[PDB]
Amino acid sequence: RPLPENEFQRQVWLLFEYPESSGPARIIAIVSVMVILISIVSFCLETLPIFRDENSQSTIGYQQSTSFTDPFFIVETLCIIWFSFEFLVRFFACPSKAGFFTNIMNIIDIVAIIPYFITLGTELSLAILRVIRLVRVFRIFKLSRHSKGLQILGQTLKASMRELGLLIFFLFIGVILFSSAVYFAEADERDSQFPSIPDAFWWAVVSMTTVGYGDMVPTTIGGKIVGSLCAIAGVLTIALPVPVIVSNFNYFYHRET
Amino acid sequence: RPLPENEFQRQVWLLFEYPESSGPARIIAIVSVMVILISIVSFCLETLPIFRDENSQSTIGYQQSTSFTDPFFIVETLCIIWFSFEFLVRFFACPSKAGFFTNIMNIIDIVAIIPYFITLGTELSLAILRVIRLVRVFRIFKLSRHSKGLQILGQTLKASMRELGLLIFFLFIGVILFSSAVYFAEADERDSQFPSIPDAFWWAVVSMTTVGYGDMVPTTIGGKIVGSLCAIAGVLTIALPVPVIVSNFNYFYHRET
Amino acid sequence: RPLPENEFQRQVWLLFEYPESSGPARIIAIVSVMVILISIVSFCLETLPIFRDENSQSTIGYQQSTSFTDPFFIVETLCIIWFSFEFLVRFFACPSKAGFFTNIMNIIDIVAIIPYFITLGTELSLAILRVIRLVRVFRIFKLSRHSKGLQILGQTLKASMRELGLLIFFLFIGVILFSSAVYFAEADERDSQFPSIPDAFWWAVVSMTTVGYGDMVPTTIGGKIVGSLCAIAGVLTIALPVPVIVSNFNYFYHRET
Amino acid sequence: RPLPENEFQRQVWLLFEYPESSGPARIIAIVSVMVILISIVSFCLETLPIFRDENSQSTIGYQQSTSFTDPFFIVETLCIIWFSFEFLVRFFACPSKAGFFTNIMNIIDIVAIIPYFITLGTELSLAILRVIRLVRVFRIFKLSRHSKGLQILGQTLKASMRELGLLIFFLFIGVILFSSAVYFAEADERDSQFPSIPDAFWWAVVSMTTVGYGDMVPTTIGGKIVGSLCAIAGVLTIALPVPVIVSNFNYFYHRET
């Protein structure tokens, strides 16, 4: 699986890939950062209740029409056009079409570009539109191309998959254990806040993480003892692999310097 | 506790003890993992309020009868049969009867197998059934035979008994101290949320762990000062032996690799 | 290490000071631990509303009389008698009269022994009885003579006085800063939960410690930004000197080994 | 330690700059510390509802008039006069006038002195006075001249600007991600507590920091899963650069000793 070998990539790839190459490259990087931030702000702003009241045709969050009256649609279209231009230039300057599914920073652009085109295509089994609108948030991840800190975070997450899986596994074990314990310790009352073990999962996760919401809490003596143990075990279980993940992050962090 | 090695049970012990020995061993390990997960899911699902609201057939969550119409009973019986087969094969290949109370990974199977048979026997004071049903959750601990991370967690807990006991001791000391302080600082009011020191134990544990529920909180100036000190001392007391436990976990974790 | 030096109290000092010296010494240590625990449980139990509701017989929690009908008074008197006997023996074996400000493990006994006698004398202005009954809780600290862990905790606290003071100083700085910020950011509304900066002190301490109660929370945009900064700065400020205190504890902990 | 250049600056500068130089210098340092604390207490006390309710007379908290009847105005005027005297003496005795815009310990005095004079000038929109009163709290930062711990904290903050920025960046990324996820997972109900993504920003910050308020919480299954992930990712994101900041603090802390 060799590279395309077009011999056409070099100039545009250097212009749009290395911000330090030239002054125009730095200008392009700054413009890209501002466009990403503008798209993020617009995405967060379309959800405000000021605009939701006057809105198949509603799950999209924007009105696609020839007139293009919605300012949010205008901003989203401009940002999507810029992202499309960037991706097309880089891909026509990207030799390794085979390694396209290996680089995360290009499938990130794919993810940031796909939702608009799916919504346009489907305008011309129902939760699909909501799922796409949710996936559209991953345009936040496109800032990783411009920030080395997010790249180090990505490398840390890649290197700490085993420790992250262990953290999730220990959380699952403790959540099941303490949810069962608190459900059975607070089962013989009508005022209990734990109708079921899956309903106690939420309380268990909230207590182990030591977040603490108060939406559901133990009321019995045994339930309170179980909650005490839940808090202690949550502290311990979280503290076990977090130092390993932190050491990975520090190694990848001071490696660049 | 190794296998007898009589040259007759050797094949069965190799199949049911070393998943990496052969392809069928890996299949058996995967089937065991799926059966354990199925049992956990079924156990968590019988408690859903779909069935409890329409209330020995009630405290157990499953109806033992000739017809055997309950699907949850069918799933539990299948999982218990598989666990019974596994334990019987391994014990028939396990010589060391003297170390019956020493091995944890086989008394775990005993614990996962016992509640079903006690409930069957006792179907033919009253909190015994609830205690048995609560103990039945420990089939979650049976996943430790297949995951090395849970084995490392068990080794860490065994190696950090003194530090864990010190953590619990410091928690008890601080809880008594701050429960007394907040009870006495918030005693001369009709709206106090601390009827007694044992009732302030819950608030103390919640504050020292920094979970934070809001179900009971100080309302006086002295009570708020006491709660401030409670939060600070809880952070400090938890942070004292957790690094020792974490160092133990990291040692046992990087020991395997 | 040296003897009491009285030339007479050597045998009693060996019996009552070194639990490992002989079997009777271990018996005395176990009896002392049980008596301390019994006193702690009785102190925590006199405050239960089962007994307090029948309403100095209420400010003190025990009725001092010739009949001595109250079981709590009987238990407290027995524990105080045992503590008095221990203190009399050890003080008859304690040389340093002028060292009133230095030794802690004997002024702990002084604190555990005063409240009963001072309340008996003062029975014969009003907050004195409540303050004494609060001080009576420090009998929990008398367990430090029997536990090496609490002794190591005391040595850590003595060695980390500067770092603990820095922690309290940073907490005070951040609490003042964020209390002022959240009071001024949430001042122009009728439903604000921060009537004053000292009233915002409680919210600041709760947020910096990341305990989280919800009794008072920001409701404005600026108040929510201030609370965000408060949580971040609380995490950072707590995390600054806690590692130093933890290193002190670990040094004093592994020193015994 | 540069030359005075005036033939007059040296003596006053040594008196008002080095507390350990002489007894009067230590007296001046103690008086300055007491004056700073008195000003802080007065500032925190003017906001109490006892005084604010019975009232340009409300935005400032003090009435500037010839009579000067307000005790809070008297205390603030005395503290401002002392700060003015200190700053004028030090500036008259300060050789390096060039580094005034770079030195932080003198612009801190400028910030502590400016609000009083601006309010006096403006007495002789409306949010300007409130902003000035809020800025007036930075007199808390003037204690850094007298405490070496706050100086070490300042050096740590200056040395850990990149890591602090990374912490804020990761917090922003996670907050946007989880706010969008929880808004979309809890959108199709009448009782949703997340009207918009910016309204979910508060919940995200509260959950990632593990503070936990309960003012808004997920109610759906998907919302609860999103909140679980939010708590886990908040723990991880906070734990990534905090050890680097703590190492910076420890380096600057043991450097002095």
Author numbering:
A (entry chain B), B (entry chain A), C (entry chain D), D (entry chain C): 138 to 192, 206 to 274, 289 to 421
Copy out sentences from the published article reporting this entry, exactly as the authors wrote them:
Among the most-studied ion channel proteins is the Kv1 family of tetrameric, six-transmembrane-segment, voltage-gated potassium (Kv) channels. We present near-atomic-resolution cryo-EM structures of the mammalian voltage-gated potassium channel Kv1.2 in open, C-type inactivated, toxin-blocked and sodium-bound states at 3.2 Å, 2.5 Å, 3.2 Å, and 2.9Å. As observed in other Kv1 and Kv2 structures, the voltage-sensing domains (VSDs) contain the membrane-spanning S1–S4 helixes while the S5, S6, pore helix and selectivity filter P-loop form the ion-conduction pore in a domain-swapped configuration. The selectivity filter of potassium channels consists of an array of four copies of the extended loop (the P-loop) formed by a highly conserved sequence, in this case TTVGYGD.
We obtained the structure of Kv1.2s in a nominally zero K+ solution, with potassium replaced with sodium in all buffers from affinity purification to size-exclusion chromatography. We were surprised to find that it is little changed from the K+ bound structure, with an essentially identical selectivity filter conformation. Like Kv1.2s in the usual potassium solution, the major density peaks are seen in the IS1 and IS3 ion binding sites, with somewhat lower occupancy of IS2 and IS4. Unfortunately, Na+ and K+ ions cannot be distinguished in the density maps, and we therefore cannot rule out the possibility that peaks in the selectivity filter region might come from contaminating K+ ions. Second, a structure of Kv1.2 in Na+ solution does not show collapse or destabilization of the selectivity filter, but instead shows an intact selectivity filter with ion density in each binding site. The Kv1.2 structure reported here with Na+ replacing essentially all K+ in the solution shows a selectivity filter conformation that is little changed from the K+ structure. Ion densities are seen in the ion-binding sites, and the occupancies of the sites are altered, but the limited resolution precludes an analysis of the coordination of ions. We conclude that the Kv1.2s selectivity filter is stable in low K+ solutions, and that the channel most likely conducts Na+ in the absence of potassium; both of these features have been observed in the NaK2K channel, where the electron density profile in the selectivity filter in Na+ is little changed when K+ is added in a small amount—1 mM—that produces partial K+ occupancy.
